[PDB]
Amino acid sequence: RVINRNNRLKRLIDLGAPEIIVNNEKRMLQESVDALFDNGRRGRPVTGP
Amino acid sequence: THIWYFKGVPSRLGYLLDLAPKDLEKIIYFAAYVITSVDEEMRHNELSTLEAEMAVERKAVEDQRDGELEARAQKLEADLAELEAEGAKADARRKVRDGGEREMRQIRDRAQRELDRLEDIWSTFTKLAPKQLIVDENLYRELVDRYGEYFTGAMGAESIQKLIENFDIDAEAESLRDVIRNGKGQKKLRALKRLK
Amino acid sequence: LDAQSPAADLVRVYLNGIGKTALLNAAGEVELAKRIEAGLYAEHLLETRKRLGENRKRDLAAVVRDGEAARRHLLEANLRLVVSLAKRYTGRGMPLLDLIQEGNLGLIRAMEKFDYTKGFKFSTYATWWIRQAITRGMADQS
Numbered sequence: 001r002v003i004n005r006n007n008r009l010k011r012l013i014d015l016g017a018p019e020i021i022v023n024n025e026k027r028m029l030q031e032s033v034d035a036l037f038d039n040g041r042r043g044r045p046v047t048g049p
Numbered sequence: 050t051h052i053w054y055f056k057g058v059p060s061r062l063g064y065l066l067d068l069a070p071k072d073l074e075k076i077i078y079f080a081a082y083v084i085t086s087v088d089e090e091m092r093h094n095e096l097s098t099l100e101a102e103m104a105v106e107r108k109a110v111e112d113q114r115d116g117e118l119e120a121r122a123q124k125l126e127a128d129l130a131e132l133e134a135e136g137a138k139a140d141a142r143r144k145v146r147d148g149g150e151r152e153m154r155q156i157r158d159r160a161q162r163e164l165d166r167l168e169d170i171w172s173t174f175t176k177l178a179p180k181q182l183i184v185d186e187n188l189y190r191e192l193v194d195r196y197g198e199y200f201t202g203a204m205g206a207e208s209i210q211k212l213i214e215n216f217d218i219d220a221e222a223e224s225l226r227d228v229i230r231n232g233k234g235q236k237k238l239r240a241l242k243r244l245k
Numbered sequence: 246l247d248a249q250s251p252a253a254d255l256v257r258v259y260l261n262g263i264g265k266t267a268l269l270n271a272a273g274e275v276e277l278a279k280r281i282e283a284g285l286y287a288e289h290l291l292e293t294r295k296r297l298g299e300n301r302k303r304d305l306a307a308v309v310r311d312g313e314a315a316r317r318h319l320l321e322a323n324l325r326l327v328v329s330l331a332k333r334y335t336g337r338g339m340p341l342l343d344l345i346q347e348g349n350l351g352l353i354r355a356m357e358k359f360d361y362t363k364g365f366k367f368s369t370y371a372t373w374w375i376r377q378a379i380t381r382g383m384a385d386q387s
Contacts, residue, residue: 008346018320021349023079024259026205028342030077034052041056043252049338058247071248080258 002036005029050077050206064243066212072182077206081182082189085201085211092177092199099196103171107164114160118153125149170195180212256342260328266321274367277315278359284312323352323371330375334383344379351378 009025035046055062055073063070075081092099128149132142170191173183177200183189189202203211228240287308324345331344355374359367 008350012350015353017353018317020263021346023204025346027079028346030050030206034056037052041052043255063246069246069248071246071250074250074252 002029002032005032050209059242062209066180066209067243068180075184076182076204076208079205081184082186082202082204083208083212084177084179084181085203085208086215087177087179087200092174092196095199096175099174100171103167107167110160110164110167114157118157121149121153121156125153256328256345259342259345260324263321263324266325268325269319269322269367274319274359275362277319278362280308280315281312282362284309284315287312320352320356323368324349326368326372327352327375330372331379334379337383339383339386344382347382348375348379351375354378 005025005028009022009029012022012025034041039045050062054060055077058070060070060073062068063073066073068076072081076083125146129142129146132145170188173188173192174196183192183202192200193202222244225240225244229237229244231237287305291305291309327348328341328345331341331348334344335341351374352371355371359365359370
């Protein structure tokens with residue numbers, strides 16, 4: 001889950017994306033890493049099926 | 050940012066930076082801008098000229114609005130005189146007058162709101178300090194296009210890194226120590242906690 | 246300060262961030278497509294023919310600024326419909342907050358290949374790409 005979004009950001013940086021979408025994706029990546037280090041620490045925890 | 054050092058209460062990042070946990074949550078997830086540095090001496094010297102420019106802008110917008118309103122008042126008076134000449138209904142004349150008054154109040158209040166924005170920009174610029182916030186993005190972009198060469202604003206963990214690399218630990222520690230020297234208990238407890 | 250926020254919404258936060266943007270009329274796409282195409286031709290000429298005229302320099306800079314503003318000023322309204330397009334494919338175990346980013350990726354991919362002043366409709370043209378992009382992304386987890 002982390003690596004998908006990191007690669008998407010790497011792809012969006014060099015395509016000259018507008019500021020809003022890259023800001024959103026950076027927020028998403030930060031949330032993903034935070035889930036990686038400790039799940040359930042904030043808001044709705046990530047859960048599998 | 051590492052999750053542990055900003056979420057687990059007491060959030061040591063907040064204690065280090067003297068920021069409310071809500072503020073840190075906002076700034077981390079890209080919901081507000083914060084100031085990284087300000088060239089205080091440059092803005093202090095340029096305050097006079099910048100005040101001159103702000104006053105010029107204010108008087109320009111005020112003159113334009115006053116002239117436009119005067120023209121509208123003259124045309125409205127001409128319309129009312131024509132209504133008197135045409136011998137129409139007096140109540141219809143009062144309806145026209147009330148509509149014109151509504152238009153005038155609307156336009157004058159629009160100019161008042163715009164000058165409110167204009168002065169709010171100056172008020173925000175005057176007391177700019179590091180570790181502040183600007184939630185309203187319109188306000189922030191206006192500050193950018195006005196004085197980008199006079200302040201530095203950022204958002205997200207990059208701002209946190211910039212703040213950290215501009216930290217003089219020893220000076221802040223000794224300032225906290227001397228605050229501890231005085232007996233102000235309510236401030237003393239906070240000083241002790243941040244010192245810890 | 247021991248402060249906390251509910252933080253029960255994130256997508257709502259994003260849509261709040263972009264919700265103040267107005268919608269566009271039926272033929273509002275060409276108004277900016279012409280500007281961006283003229284800007285592209287102007288910048289190609291600048292990279293080919295240079296130092297010809299001092300007034301031409303400021304004119305070409307102005308038209309390039311117009312093209313950039315156009316590129317920024319035709320994207321905002323489409324998010325209010327990309328969210329709806331994504332919502333049609335929710336509940337399949339993948340967060341719609343994930344769907345929206347690839348939806349925007351398809352959006353830019355379609356916008357950059359809109360047309361050459363050819364008569365068409367912007368919204369359906371965008372959807373033609375957005376649906377396939379988001380469905381491809383959803384299938385990619387398999």
